[PDB]
Amino acid sequence: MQYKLILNGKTLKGETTTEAVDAATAEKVFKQYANDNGVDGEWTYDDATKTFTVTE
């Protein structure tokens, strides 16, 4: 139920950790992380790893 947020890019790197009931809940807030951190990259979603990460 725990998901991790990783931020990469050229000069933009960051790591995050959050806990929720499900990814559906984390997904909405997670997207805010990128938006909150004007991050523009590629997003991936794994059901087995229920983890969200953004790579530019």
Curated annotation (Swiss-Prot):
It comes from Streptococcus sp. group G. It is found in: Secreted, Cell wall. The chain holds residues 303 to 357 of 593 of the full protein. Sequence repeats lie at residues 2-56. This is Immunoglobulin G-binding protein G.
